[PDB]
């Protein structure tokens, strides 16, 4: 290509169009592109339809593109990975009519302040959803009904104050949940359901230790080796398990899993 780097790795074709002052998709890219990098351009509006000529395209990065609108015309039947991180999106692109094979969606570090009812409808193959660093306060009911195969979910570093009780319903395969550094104060009873969850990050929330925290206290007991602290810059296999990171607010660091619950339920005596 005269502008983008093209890197052939056996059958694989990875095209690097990163940081090239592009304001539009270049028109002469290989028809056989597997992976397209469009990071750090200026793609304010981007049309998914423009990528239809690329039949073998499985991964697209539009990260750090000052993107504000992603037009969802047309259909990309083989796109598996879409990275929209570090942009300016003020509402979530609604993609289920467009990317039926999507397994990975990253929209971390945008300007999202809520997700609409049905946001993920039609993304039935989704396995990973990253929403770290937006401005979310809660989630709509039924958010993950469309996505029963979900494996990893990040809501880290939002400003969440309520989680719907059935959020995790029918997630038979969930393996990582990141909820650290929000404004959460309680967990609805039964929130976790009955499936094993190997990695939960729950620290940096002002948990309210009253009788309604008992559910969470008992879950933390049964799951102490599954509760971790996020460390930046490393692999997750490098990170410390620490059930005591999860602390009662207004407490001086009293660990929720320790919560006595003495005299619950509170009644007149």
């Amino acid at each position: 290509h005269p502008i983008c780097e093209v890197s052939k790795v056996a059958s694989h074709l990875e095209v690097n169009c990163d940081k090239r002052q592009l304001t539009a998709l270049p028109p002469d890219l290989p028809k056989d592109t597997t992976i397209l990098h469009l990071s750090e351009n200026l793609l304010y509006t981007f049309s998914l339809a423009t990528l239809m000529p690329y039949t073998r395209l499985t991964q697209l990065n539009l990260d750090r593109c000052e993107l504000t609108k992603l037009q969802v015309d047309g259909t990309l039947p083989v796109l598996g990975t879409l990275d929209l991180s570090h942009n300016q999106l003020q509402s979530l692109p609604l993609l289920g009519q467009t990317l039926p094979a999507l397994t990975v969606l990253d929209v971390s570090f945008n300007r999202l302040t809520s997700l609409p009812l049905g946001a993920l409808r039609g993304l039935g193959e989704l396995q990973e959803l990253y929403l770290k660093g937006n401005e979310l306060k809660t989630l709509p009911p039924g958010l993950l009904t469309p996505t029963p195969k979900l494996e990893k979910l990040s809501l880290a570093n939002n400003q969440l104050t309520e989680l719907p009780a059935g959020l995790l319903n029918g997630l038979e395969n969930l393996d990582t949940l990141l909820l650290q550094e929000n404004s959460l104060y309680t967990i609805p009873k039964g929130f976790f359901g009955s499936h094993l969850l190997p990695f939960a990050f729950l620290h940096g929330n002002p948990w309210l230790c009253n009788c309604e925290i008992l559910y969470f206290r008992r879950w933390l007991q049964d799951n102490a080796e599954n509760v971790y602290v996020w460390k930046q810059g490393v692999d997750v296999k490098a990170m410390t398990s620490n059930v005591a990171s999860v602390q009662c607010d207004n407490s001086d660091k009293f660990p929720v899993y320790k919560y006595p619950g003495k005299g619950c339920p509170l009644v007149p005596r």
Partner: peptide
Amino acid sequence: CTERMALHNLC
């Protein structure tokens, strides 16, 4: 390195 890379041990 990103959250996503970290969770796959690809940092």
